[PDB]
Amino acid sequence: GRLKELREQLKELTKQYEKSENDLKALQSVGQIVGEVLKQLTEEKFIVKATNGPRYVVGCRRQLDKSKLKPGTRVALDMTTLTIMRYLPRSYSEIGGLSEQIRELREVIELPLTNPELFQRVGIIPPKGCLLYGPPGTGKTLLARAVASQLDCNFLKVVDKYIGESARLIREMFNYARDHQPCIIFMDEIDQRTLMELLNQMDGFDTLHRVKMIMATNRPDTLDPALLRPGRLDRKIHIDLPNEQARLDILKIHAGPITKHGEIDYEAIVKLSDGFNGADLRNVCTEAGMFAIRADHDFVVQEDFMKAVRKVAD
Amino acid sequence: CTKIINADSEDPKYIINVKQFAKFVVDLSDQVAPTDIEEGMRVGVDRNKYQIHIPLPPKIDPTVTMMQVEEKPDVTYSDVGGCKEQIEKLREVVET
Amino acid sequence: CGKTMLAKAVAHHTTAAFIRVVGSEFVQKYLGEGPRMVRDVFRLAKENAPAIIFIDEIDAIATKRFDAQT
Amino acid sequence: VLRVTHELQAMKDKIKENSEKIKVNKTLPYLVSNVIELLDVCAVIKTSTRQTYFLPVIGLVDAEKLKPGDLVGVNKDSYLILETLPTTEQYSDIGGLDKQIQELVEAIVLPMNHKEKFENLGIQPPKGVLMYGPPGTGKTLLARACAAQTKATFLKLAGPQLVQGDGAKLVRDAFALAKEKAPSIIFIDELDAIGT
Amino acid sequence: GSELVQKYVGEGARMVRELFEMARTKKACLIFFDEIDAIGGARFDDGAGGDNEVQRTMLELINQLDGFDPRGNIKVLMATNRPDTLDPALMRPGRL
Ligand SMILES: Nc1ncnc2c1ncn2[C@@H]1O[C@H](COP(=O)(O)OP(=O)(O)OP(=O)(O)O)[C@@H](O)[C@H]1O
């Protein structure tokens, strides 16, 4: 017994001493100044700039793999010789009836995303994107992130020009987008010679990677005839008019994640208020939940929805 | 001159920053009573010695001090005329 | 009726330093970049070889002067 | 018996190392600053002189508790990390906006009063309340009254005071201060000044 | 008014704060602002936003003037030739 602690003690005696050697050895590194490879002046020397601003010319130390040190590459240089060292780069249907959504949109979004061989054999460049238009909110604000669900891939939301940074950033993120072929760029709420210049990126500027850049947004008031011309904008999809039954389906979908008695006359509620909008039905559900919170009702009583329906109708 | 921004128990270990260069964790100078050192007021540190040698009075910002009129022009209401109502209204908001 | 495509073809089958880069620039701070560009191109022209420029939609800059005060 | 010898040996390497370790802080070029980030075969430190240094040796202290972004004790000349260092009105005095008053209440105190109902219903209360309207339509007064009535800690923020990375660091410090205390009321005035 | 505006961003707000603190230290102080239209007497704030510095300085000024806990003993006078250009924020009573 008296020896067991001694065994563990030994591990301790080394442990604190272990750090001493690690601390002493660590107690000598002088660090380095971080900078970027501004350009490859020569296979032996290159022009770099430290984050502080000054620009120098340095060289690989032993083997810095110039093949991978293309113009622009973080590297830390010692402030005694300025040499290159370690380099380190630093719901499918939430709108009820979506037959319109799961149809033309699907057939024009995924079809050009799978078999480029089909079209190139046809000799026709695949359509690059389609435009959706109709009621704001349900058709515009909603079902916008849902496209990722429909395609099951993460998308990028892109909200004359100041300096042209619109097109500049579009291209600069285009490579990232192309790195993920299934990814779809969704420049919703997109809104001279930037929109028209915006018509030139799609033709070239790395647009041969099988991605449908759907310019689907009613926000732009001005419509470009060249864009709607076949090719660029293959076709236009009009957001369907809610029929007050799709409203019932939307209410049911949103009624899902809600605790309630169950005796909900959903048809009565939808007839009470014509929200007409999936976000309006979301607000209806939220207001019903709030009314339930009043008086501390874990459930939601029938009249609470009706108050919610009436409130939104205003 | 430096501004103190914090202090710690045991060793004081002030986090003073001089003007804008950088925060320095400097101990009090040998020849200073710890009571004088406090938070958020001007003090004096030497470069190499890095230590707070003497407390300093607060900044005055002479622009603001000289901005004060510190002078009474020789103008009286008597010379002004035709603004009796305005004069009274201003007086009710300044003097009375 | 065939324009931009013709310029594109000229670019594809030439040897000059064709730098179009003439986005119609109303701008608000740097006004009059004409010389800022052409000189560069001329500097490019002597740097490597004579260059060419091309663009449409310059109709906005055409104008006819008229008023000089507004 | 050799065990005590090793443990008495510990009063050996530690004393010298302590003396050196307790100089970078004291030294003027300490430049105690924030660690830009952390990596592995290592530290990246933005010195308070607006300079980015890369340290192969991640630091003398073990790297587990080197949180990306924190008071970093950069060495005077090695710029290696040494020490983490320490980091009256009522709702009856305003009229014509009572409905807004109850809305703000149910959105701001109900989480403070009881959030269980929200979880029960499956809907959470949004965070952040915007008060927009003509300069006359009282909201600073409403905010002051709400702070006075409800017992929490006020956090007054203004566009001018924030601006001077001074703005970002000040915002982060204030937000962290709010995070530390469970009850927190954050007041940002003329927010348009910042979010231009 | 010109002395308030400086080349450095935000300096005007800092000097406004300094003046406010100097007033707070004193008792029964009167302040007179002339050419107020000079010191951010507008809120156009176009996309260019070239006046952002004077604008933020004016915002700091108005905030320190009234809001939360003012001194309540600071009598402010203001002389402008064309108040119509002044912003709603300052012209609104309570501040003036
Ligand atoms: N409904 C109201 N009841 C009482 N006082 C009000 C009301 N509306 C405005 N006020 C007055 O306005 C002030 C309340 O804050 P204030 O009006 O400054 O904020 P605001 O109108 O939201 O805009 P700002 O803060 O930009 O001025 C107090 O002087 C208060 O007496």
GROMACS .gro file of C-alpha atoms in nm, chain A residues 6 9-10 12-14 16-17 19-35 51-52 74 76 86 88 90 257-259 285-286 289-290 292-294 296-300, chain D residues 2-3 6-7 10 12-14 16-17 20-21 36-40 42-44 50-57 59-62 77-80 102 106 110 114 117-123:
model
   94
    6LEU     CA    1   0.506   0.627  -0.454
    9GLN     CA    2   0.421   1.015  -0.705
   10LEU     CA    3   0.697   0.923  -0.950
   12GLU     CA    4   0.407   1.350  -1.060
   13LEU     CA    5   0.776   1.413  -0.989
   14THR     CA    6   0.841   1.372  -1.361
   16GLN     CA    7   0.635   1.898  -1.301
   17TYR     CA    8   0.992   1.840  -1.416
   19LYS     CA    9   0.709   2.090  -1.792
   20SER     CA   10   1.040   2.250  -1.692
   21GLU     CA   11   1.210   2.105  -1.999
   22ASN     CA   12   0.910   2.191  -2.216
   23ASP     CA   13   0.899   2.541  -2.068
   24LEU     CA   14   1.273   2.595  -2.107
   25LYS     CA   15   1.270   2.473  -2.467
   26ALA     CA   16   0.960   2.683  -2.538
   27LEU     CA   17   1.136   2.975  -2.366
   28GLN     CA   18   1.352   3.055  -2.671
   29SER     CA   19   1.132   3.085  -2.982
   30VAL     CA   20   1.139   3.447  -3.099
   31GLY     CA   21   0.827   3.428  -3.313
   32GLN     CA   22   0.802   3.584  -3.656
   33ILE     CA   23   0.622   3.855  -3.850
   34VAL     CA   24   0.333   3.739  -4.065
   35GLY     CA   25   0.310   3.854  -4.425
   51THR     CA   26   0.097   4.292  -4.209
   52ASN     CA   27   0.256   4.609  -4.070
   74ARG     CA   28   0.056   3.363  -4.570
   76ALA     CA   29   0.594   3.402  -4.122
   86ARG     CA   30   0.609   2.762  -4.221
   88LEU     CA   31  -0.036   2.854  -4.314
   90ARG     CA   32  -0.551   3.183  -4.254
  257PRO     CA   33  -4.479   2.233  -3.384
  258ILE     CA   34  -4.749   2.378  -3.158
  259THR     CA   35  -4.900   2.233  -2.840
  285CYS     CA   36  -4.940   3.074  -3.524
  286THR     CA   37  -4.712   3.304  -3.325
  289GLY     CA   38  -4.904   3.098  -2.908
  290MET     CA   39  -4.881   3.441  -2.747
  292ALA     CA   40  -5.190   3.104  -2.504
  293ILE     CA   41  -4.902   3.254  -2.307
  294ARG     CA   42  -5.155   3.502  -2.174
  296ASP     CA   43  -5.028   3.074  -1.896
  297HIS     CA   44  -5.192   2.811  -2.118
  298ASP     CA   45  -4.939   2.549  -2.227
  299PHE     CA   46  -5.194   2.449  -2.492
  300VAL     CA   47  -5.368   2.694  -2.725
  482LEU     CA   48   1.472   0.898  -0.439
  483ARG     CA   49   1.117   1.031  -0.473
  486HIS     CA   50   1.307   1.450  -0.760
  487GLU     CA   51   1.038   1.655  -0.586
  490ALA     CA   52   1.134   2.060  -0.873
  492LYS     CA   53   1.513   2.387  -0.919
  493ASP     CA   54   1.398   2.444  -1.286
  494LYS     CA   55   1.076   2.630  -1.176
  496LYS     CA   56   1.477   3.016  -1.283
  497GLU     CA   57   1.191   2.977  -1.530
  500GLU     CA   58   1.234   3.488  -1.682
  501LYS     CA   59   0.859   3.430  -1.720
  516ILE     CA   60  -0.555   3.647  -3.345
  517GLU     CA   61  -0.595   3.270  -3.356
  518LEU     CA   62  -0.451   2.929  -3.271
  519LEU     CA   63  -0.315   2.644  -3.482
  520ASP     CA   64  -0.122   2.319  -3.449
  522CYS     CA   65   0.122   2.750  -3.256
  523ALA     CA   66  -0.013   3.099  -3.185
  524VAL     CA   67  -0.104   3.404  -3.394
  530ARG     CA   68  -0.130   4.673  -3.472
  531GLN     CA   69   0.116   4.403  -3.579
  532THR     CA   70   0.047   4.037  -3.656
  533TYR     CA   71   0.312   3.792  -3.534
  534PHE     CA   72   0.322   3.415  -3.573
  535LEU     CA   73   0.468   3.213  -3.286
  536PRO     CA   74   0.568   2.852  -3.365
  537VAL     CA   75   0.588   2.781  -2.994
  539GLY     CA   76   0.332   2.961  -2.570
  540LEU     CA   77   0.482   2.867  -2.237
  541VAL     CA   78   0.141   2.805  -2.081
  542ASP     CA   79  -0.048   2.504  -2.213
  557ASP     CA   80   1.084   4.060  -2.782
  558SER     CA   81   0.988   3.698  -2.847
  559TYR     CA   82   0.620   3.801  -2.853
  560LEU     CA   83   0.529   3.459  -2.716
  582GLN     CA   84  -4.753   4.558  -2.350
  586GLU     CA   85  -4.442   4.042  -2.350
  590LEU     CA   86  -4.171   3.735  -2.043
  594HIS     CA   87  -4.105   3.274  -1.740
  597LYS     CA   88  -4.453   2.860  -2.184
  598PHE     CA   89  -4.262   2.962  -2.496
  599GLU     CA   90  -4.083   2.626  -2.502
  600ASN     CA   91  -4.414   2.450  -2.440
  601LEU     CA   92  -4.569   2.615  -2.745
  602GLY     CA   93  -4.256   2.549  -2.952
  603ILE     CA   94  -4.201   2.919  -3.032
   0.00000   0.00000   0.00000
